[PDB]
């Protein structure tokens, strides 16, 4: 690879220079002949594989604290090396854990919210042993991050992987999600994205309310044991009823959403260590709710019912009735969250912040990995400043990664 | 190896085998993806490129290995020997031009690819000749509003010193003027080209919708100015089906989108002047050609006349105004019987095209970054469509602006 890569902004003509890509680690999926940039997703590590991965991370940490090559740096290297030799693994210090988690976010090429990356509250849950203890940690996480509507980003980090047979997992994809119920007639009640997980919960003993907005229980696996169900205390689940500043009939749709987006199915890799349970949360960009959660056809799919109440012509697509209704839905979502003093960011503000963040990273870090396909919002893309911004995508470590769904791999006891 | 693409809305999986037939670079590597970067001969190089193209042409007409195929290969071989180049047959020229469109990974309009009218202008020698061919193209493609895809192919590059170039980026564009008080009258994308026309003797009317002259370079000579006869330039006044004040904005656009600055590569030959045209997707006018900050930038006025609260972005006043502008554009073209497609219909057609291509061809190279419309992305079917991007030839390529290379 060449040592400098240039990215241009075609709206502003600003040209930036990336050198950070020289530190990229794993693969993108692309090759010289094919680009897989729109592909969504393109038995543990041995002693020999772990040594270089740990040294690389330790070097990076000590370089970040301006202590590279110091006595403490060399001692930490040797202590890690000894520990890998005699135990086939090692343990991160709390400082390294915190640094690692913040940098996995800083490195998340698909995240538009990264201007916030250094303000992450990291909860160390590596002393957890049981699913009840996981539940306690997750409740405290949710209560802290929710903060009565003044949301704070947070991550809770459960014990790392050992042999792969003792994994901690949150079986939920997000901590807070609504159930979906497949009906005998083919229709779906609630959130259609969640039918499979909902059926699993019912098999594990969940008694479903069978409603439109039923918060799913947590399904929590500790130390490789079978997962266990826990109901989140409903007073910890902050929710926002959706109304519209102009359309009085919009409240009659009976819509609401929860305030806290919290991803719980990803894997945090730090120094070759694998944290298979690391729920993290921030706050919503409006379009995540208003465009996707409500208007995706395979989701709540309310565009038609909003358009009908707006009395648009729905017989020609060229009336753009869908686009009109989509904007009004996203107006209502932002207005409902702001009126209830629950933190939310519109896509204009978020993308402008991300451009400012990206420019600072280029100037201070030598680059900023970004996945344009994900960074550009799902509505009004070209009137946001990221649409015109060329981006380089590459994988830095520490990182968040996808992992298989645990019901596909779990060996039931 | 076979590759799969999933649509996450329908869960349809397609299997791509066609990418195995690509040879040019994408710009990405195993470690860096450049999927959102806009821009990432001799005898000895030519014959393999010619052989490959002849091979795929005689394979496309089910006469691979025929006597006609062998003789064509020998004919081309001898011709590169004695002249350092060769000439395409008419049938080959048409095949290569349709397939360059078919292979254009950034084009959502490719369902039409095999209905392309190909105008052979390889006998052209002067800018007056180019002007004639271009007027005939414009008149044919416009067709009184029933727009027809077309491409006009001028002589191929020879020694790089005698290139044919259309200096305009599009055949029909409005001028942009650097206003002394700071801003820009007309179209701000074309300010530089507008000044080169004035520098070449063009008398600007200095309006908001002044059609630029053609600036045409034949055989490497200095380019020459021509005015497209105005009866050939179909325009649409933009009005709105419900907002009666919208027509008072004074806006109009031309009906014919016609790219004139790209290079057509066929069998190793380079056609540096190959203007091609189709019809508009409405967002091309109404999102980009009006609302880009570096373009006409009329969102504020529309939102103003709509009495929208513009004090904070979270009112989404920009998004509301954007939709109404695009409603008006579609309404206007349709009301004037000028061919236009909305981004919902266009992306539907492209998904159908993709399925067609995977079944008959083994894949379809597609550039998600460019295929997804610049507004309402995820309520179109292409947003949820995984795509593989790879470079097949014949192809359209970018080239440098002539005013950076030409010696006067
Ligand atoms: C603080 C406010 C935040 C905002 C506004 C935000 C915004 C977003 C958005 C809009 C996406 C794309 C969502 C989608 O379409 O699925 C995303 C993805 C992502 N975010 Fe952030 N995020 C925030 C916080 C965080 C935090 C705290 C972390 C981790 C420490 C994080 C890590 C990620 C990752 C890994 C992805 C990729 C998700 C995937 O590939 O499925 N984000 N973010
Ligand atoms: C017939 C109706 C057509 C429609 C609706 C259409 C639509 C589009 C759109 C929306 C783009 C995005 C480009 C941009 O945003 O600037 C595009 C790109 C492109 N189109 Fe099509 N197109 C059509 C016809 C054609 C024809 C006839 C050709 C060639 C024979 C062609 C070749 C291309 C190429 C090469 C690009 C890539 C341009 C670039 O890389 O800058 N298109 N098309
Ligand atoms: C920490 C964080 C903050 C934030 N703001 N976002 C995320 C992204 C992950 C995510 C979490 C979530 F709780 C809901 C969605 C949106 C729902 C779905 C997911 C699918 F991609 C289509 N919809 C957009 C996406 C993470
Ligand atoms: C043959 C053809 C048909 C069609 N429908 N489209 C194209 C795409 C190229 C293009 C040509 C054109 F004559 C006007 C635009 C307006 C778009 C503008 C250009 C600028 F880069 C920012 N906008 C996106 C774009 C080609
Ligand atoms: C940075 C990015 O590559 C650039 O803005 C691209 C993005 N996608 C696009 N898509 C289309 N259809 N047209 C464009 O001009 C662009 N510009
Ligand atoms: C096929 C395509 O990769 C897929 O629809 C992606 C596109 N971009 C996205 N961008 C975001 N932010 N979130 C998504 O879920 C997706 N989905
Ligand atoms: Zn790529």
Angle B354-B355-B357 (CA atoms, 0-180°, nearest 5)? 65
What the block records as the tokens of A251 is 């409240």
In terms of domains, do B118 and B219 share one?
no
Determine the distance separating the centroid of ligand 6 and the alpha carbon of B154, expressed in angstroms. Answer: 41
* Beta bridge partner(s), residue A285: A345
Q: In whole angstroms, give the CA distance from residue B387 to residue B371.
A: 10
Q: Is residue A38 part of a domain?
A: yes
Interacting residues of B112 by C-beta distance below 8 A, sequence separation 6+: B149, B278
Return the ligand 3 atom nearest residue A378 CA.
24
3-state secondary structure B52-109: HHHHHHHHHCCCCCCHHHHHHHHHHHHHHHHHCCCCCCHHHHHHHHHHHHHCCCCCCC
Nearest to A383 by CA among A327, A335, A337, A339: A327
CA-to-CA dists, residue A107 to A104, A114, A152, A268, angstroms: 5, 8, 19, 12
- Nearest-CA distance A322 → chain B (Å): 8
Experimental method: X-ray
Query: Could you tell me where the DSSP H helices lie in B103-227?
Result: 127-142, 191-199
- Is residue A315 packed enough to be buried (19+ CB in 10 Å), middle (13-18) or exposed (0-12)? exposed
Nearest chain A residue to B299, by CA: A383
In terms of domains, do A158 and A46 share one?
yes
Interacting residues of B285 by C-beta distance below 8 A, sequence separation 6+: B253, B329
In terms of domains, do A58 and A121 share one?
yes
Domain that holds residue B32: 16-122+149-159+263-277+347-371
- Note whether A31 contacts B28, CB cutoff 8 Å: yes
* Pairs of residues, one from chain A and one from chain B, whose beta carbons lie less than 8 Å apart: 208
Q: In whole angstroms, give the CA distance from residue B405 to residue B408.
A: 10
What the block records as the tokens of A159 is 């014990």
CA-to-CA dists, residue A123 to A102, A120, A280, B367, angstroms: 12, 10, 10, 41
Q: Pick out the residues of the known binding site of A for heme b.
A: 111, 402
What CATH number corresponds to the domain at position B307?
3.90.1230.10
- Note whether A35 contacts B388, CB cutoff 8 Å: yes
What CATH number corresponds to the domain at position A65?
3.90.340.10
Task: For residue B110, indicate whether it is catalytic.
Answer: yes
- Note whether A394 contacts B23, CB cutoff 8 Å: no
Q: In whole angstroms, give the CA distance from residue A3 to residue B377.
A: 35
Q: In whole angstroms, give the CA distance from residue A52 to residue A103.
A: 19
Task: For residue A152, indicate whether it is catalytic.
Answer: no
Nearest chain B residue to A319, by CA: B327
Contact present, B343 and B351 (Cβ < 8 Å): no
Angle B176-A387-A307 (CA atoms, 0-180°, nearest 5)? 100
Nearest chain A residue to B389, by CA: A35
In terms of domains, do A214 and A94 share one?
no
Q: Please spell the DSSP secondary structure of B225-274, one letter per residue.
A: EEPPPGGG--EEE---SS-TTGGGG--EEES--EE-S-EEEETTEEES--
In terms of domains, do A250 and A146 share one?
no
Question: What are the helix and strand counts (H, E) for chain B?
Answer: 11, 18
* Token pair 């699993």: residue: A200
Q: Whose CA is nearest to atom 14 of ligand 4?
A: B257
Q: Whose CA is nearest to atom 18 of ligand 2?
A: B107
CA-to-CA dists, residue A108 to A111, A117, A166, A268, angstroms: 6, 10, 27, 11
Q: Is residue A360 part of a domain?
A: yes
In terms of domains, do A200 and A139 share one?
yes
Q: Is residue B383 part of a domain?
A: no
Q: Is residue A2 part of a domain?
A: no
Candidate list A76, A96, A106, A114, residue with the active-site label: A114
Which chain B positions have a beta carbon within 8 Å of A24's beta carbon? 31-32
In terms of domains, do B201 and B211 share one?
yes
Q: In whole angstroms, give the CA distance from residue A32 to residue A142.
A: 44
Q: In whole angstroms, give the CA distance from residue B233 to residue A220.
A: 67
Coil, strand, or helix at residue B3? Answer: strand
In terms of domains, do A229 and A245 share one?
no
Q: Is residue A223 part of a domain?
A: yes
If you ran DSSP here, which 8-state letter would residue B389 be given? B
Interacting residues of B331 by C-beta distance below 8 A, sequence separation 6+: A318, B239, B240, B241
Return the ligand 2 atom nearest residue B288 CA.
15
Task: For residue A288, indicate whether it is catalytic.
Answer: yes
What the block records as the tokens of A230 is 């826990």
CA-to-CA dists, residue A139 to A46, A146, A205, angstroms: 35, 10, 21
CA A54 vs. chain centroid, Å, equals 25
CA-to-CA dists, residue A93 to A63, A97, A150, A276, angstroms: 16, 6, 30, 18
Q: Please spell the DSSP secondary structure of A247-301, one letter per residue.
A: -GGGGGG--EEES--EE-S-EEEETTEEES---EE--EEHHIIIIIIHHSTTTT-
Q: Are strands B214-217 and A228-230 parallel, antiparallel or unpaired?
A: unpaired
Q: In whole angstroms, give the CA distance from residue A351 to residue A355.
A: 6
If you ran DSSP here, which 8-state letter would residue B219 be given? T
Q: In whole angstroms, give the CA distance from residue A243 to residue A255.
A: 8
Contact present, B330 and B92 (Cβ < 8 Å): no
Determine the distance separating the centroid of ligand 4 and the alpha carbon of B278, expressed in angstroms. Answer: 10
In terms of domains, do A97 and A181 share one?
no
Coil, strand, or helix at residue A32? Answer: coil
Query: Within an 8 Å CB–CB cutoff, is residue B243 touching chain A?
Result: no
* Residues belonging to chain A: 413
- Note whether A331 contacts B322, CB cutoff 8 Å: no
Angle B5-B381-B351 (CA atoms, 0-180°, nearest 5)? 60
Which chain B positions have a beta carbon within 8 Å of A335's beta carbon? 314
CB atoms within 10 A of CB B191: 17
Q: Is residue A381 part of a domain?
A: no
What the block records as the tokens of A77 is 């290297």
Number of domains in chain B: 3
Return the ligand 2 atom nearest residue B147 CA.
1
Q: Is residue B384 part of a domain?
A: no
Contact present, A190 and A214 (Cβ < 8 Å): yes
Q: Pick out the residues of the known binding site of B for heme b.
A: 107, 398
A 75-104 residues with CB < 8 A to B: none
In terms of domains, do B252 and B218 share one?
no
What the block records as the tokens of B107 is 């084009």
Determine the distance separating the centroid of ligand 1 and the alpha carbon of A1, expressed in angstroms. Answer: 29
Cβ of B35 less than 6 Å from ligand 6: no
Q: Is residue A6 part of a domain?
A: no
If you ran DSSP here, which 8-state letter would residue B286 be given? I
Interacting residues of B312 by C-beta distance below 8 A, sequence separation 6+: none
Task: Please give the span between the terminal C-alpha atoms of chain B, in angstroms, as a whole number.
Answer: 51
In terms of domains, do B337 and B188 share one?
no
Task: Please give the span between the terminal C-alpha atoms of chain A, in angstroms, as a whole number.
Answer: 49
Return the ligand 4 atom nearest residue B170 CA.
13
Task: For residue A206, indicate whether it is catalytic.
Answer: no
Contact present, A198 and A161 (Cβ < 8 Å): no
Burial A169-198 (b: 16+ CB within 10 A, else e): bbbbbbbbbbbbbeeeeeebbbbbbbbebb
In terms of domains, do B70 and B26 share one?
yes
Q: In whole angstroms, give the CA distance from residue A347 to residue B314.
A: 8
* Token pair 């020999």: residue: A48
Handedness of CA A20, A23, A26, A27 (dihedral sign): positive
Coil, strand, or helix at residue A396? Answer: coil
Q: In whole angstroms, give the CA distance from residue A369 to residue B31.
A: 11
If you ran DSSP here, which 8-state letter would residue A225 be given? P
CB atoms within 10 A of CB B215: 22
């Amino acid at each position: 690879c060449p040592r400098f890569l240039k990215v241009k902004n075609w709206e502003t003509e600003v040209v930036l220079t990336d050198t950070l890509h020289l530190k990229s680690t794993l693969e993108t999926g692309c090759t010289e002949y094919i680009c897989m940039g729109s592909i969504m997703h393109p038995d543990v590590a041995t002693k020999d594989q772990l040594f270089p991965l740990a040294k690389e991370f330790i070097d990076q940490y000590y370089s970040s604290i301006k202590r590279f090559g110091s006595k403490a740096h060399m001692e930490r290297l040797e202590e890690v090396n000894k520990e890998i030799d005699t135990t086939s693994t090692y343990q991160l210090k709390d400082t390294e854990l915190i640094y690692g988690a913040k940098h996995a976010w800083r490195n998340a090429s698909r995240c538009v919210g990264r201007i916030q990356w250094s303000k992450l509250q990291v909860f160390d849950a590596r002393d957890c042993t049981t699913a009840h203890g996981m539940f306690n940690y997750i409740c405290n996480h949710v209560k802290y991050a929710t903060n009565k509507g003044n949301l704070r980003s947070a991550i809770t980090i459960f014990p790392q992987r050992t042999d792969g047979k003792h994994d901690f997992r949150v079986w939920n994809s997000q901590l807070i999600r609504y159930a979906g119920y497949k009906q005998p007639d083919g229709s779906t009640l609630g959130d259609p994205a969640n039918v499979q997980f909902t059926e699993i919960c019912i098999q594990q003993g969940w008694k479903p309310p069978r409603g439109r907005f039923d918060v799913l229980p947590l399904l929590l696996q500790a130390n490789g044991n079978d997962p266990e169900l826990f109901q989140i205390p409903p007073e910890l689940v902050l929710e926002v009823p959706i109304r519209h500043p102009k359309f009085e009939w919009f409240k009659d749709l009976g819509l609401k959403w929860y305030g806290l987006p919290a991803v719980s199915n990803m894997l945090l890799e730090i120094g070759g260590l694998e944290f298979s349970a690391c729920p993290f949360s921030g706050w919503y960009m409006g379009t995540e709710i208003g465009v996707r959660d409500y208007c995706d056809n395979s989701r709540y799919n309310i565009l038609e019912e909003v358009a009908k109440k707006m009395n648009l012509d729905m017989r020609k697509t060229s009336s753009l009735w869908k686009d009109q209704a989509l904007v009004e839905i996203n107006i209502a979502v932002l207005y409902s969250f702001q009126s209830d003093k629950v933190t939310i960011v519109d896509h204009h503000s978020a993308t402008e912040s991300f451009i400012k963040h990206m420019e600072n990273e280029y100037r201070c870090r030598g680059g900023c990995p970004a996945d344009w396909v994900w960074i550009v919002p799902p509505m009004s893309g070209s009137i946001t400043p990221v649409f015109h911004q060329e981006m380089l995508n590459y994988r830095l470590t520490p990182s968040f990664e996808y992992q298989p769904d645990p019901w596909n791999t779990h060996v039931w006891k």
